[PDB]
Amino acid sequence: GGNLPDVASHYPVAYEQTLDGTVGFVIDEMTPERATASVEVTDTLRQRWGLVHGGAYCALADMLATEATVAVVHEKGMMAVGQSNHTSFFRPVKEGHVRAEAVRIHAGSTTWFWDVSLRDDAGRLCAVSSMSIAVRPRRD
Template identity: 50%
Template sequence: MELPTTIPHERTLDGLIGLRVHDQGDGWIEASVPVVDGVRQPMGLVHGGVYAAIAESVTSMATAAAVMPDGFVAQGLSNATNFLRPILEGTVHARADRLHRGRTTWVWDVRMTDDAGRLAATTRMVIAVRALAG
């Protein structure tokens, strides 16, 4: 199985929610999503699924960047997102820090904050690392 590499970013979920990666290093990644109508639920706050999507996307990206050169792929295995405070406007800021780098799974802690730096959601994300089948 070969991974699709020609899907334009704007046609993916990341593109639809406006996810932008700002910086990353060994074991961490930072990104953001602007709060616009398309990421809000009917009551006007950021939809819980957006937080879960941010967490899965950034941790998958960071894991993939590390394992793909060795012929492996990264895919979400478990996503446990907790909501602590609503965000109604501005930007959702995310920082993911790797807690565990195993042979077949990586574990990440993702913190999502508002523009004032207040914690809005946290995610414990487990990423599966699998051989790219050819």
């Protein structure tokens, strides 16, 4: 179901209706320290100049990093949400795929930090995103 971590019986929004399902994000691997995801480039991921949208690299990074955090902390009664995302853009992507790899670099009680690499089909580093993920007690 994008292969997102299956941690609850019900979710407020179905995959195919989320921004994630609309653009086509799919999680490949997930462990507590490292996760990967990818997306096919289609026009839905593009801006009007024909390049993948800045927003798309950020969105990918945000979903991957946050859900990799959810995968661990949800069963502990915690919620996780993106608190900061800093994406820098080194080379455009015009077509093909964008592949993300999220590497956990700090896991604190209140904040987890992941470095996310975004690569094209040739494996070139096209963008990076520093995701900071707030972890808080789940509200009833």
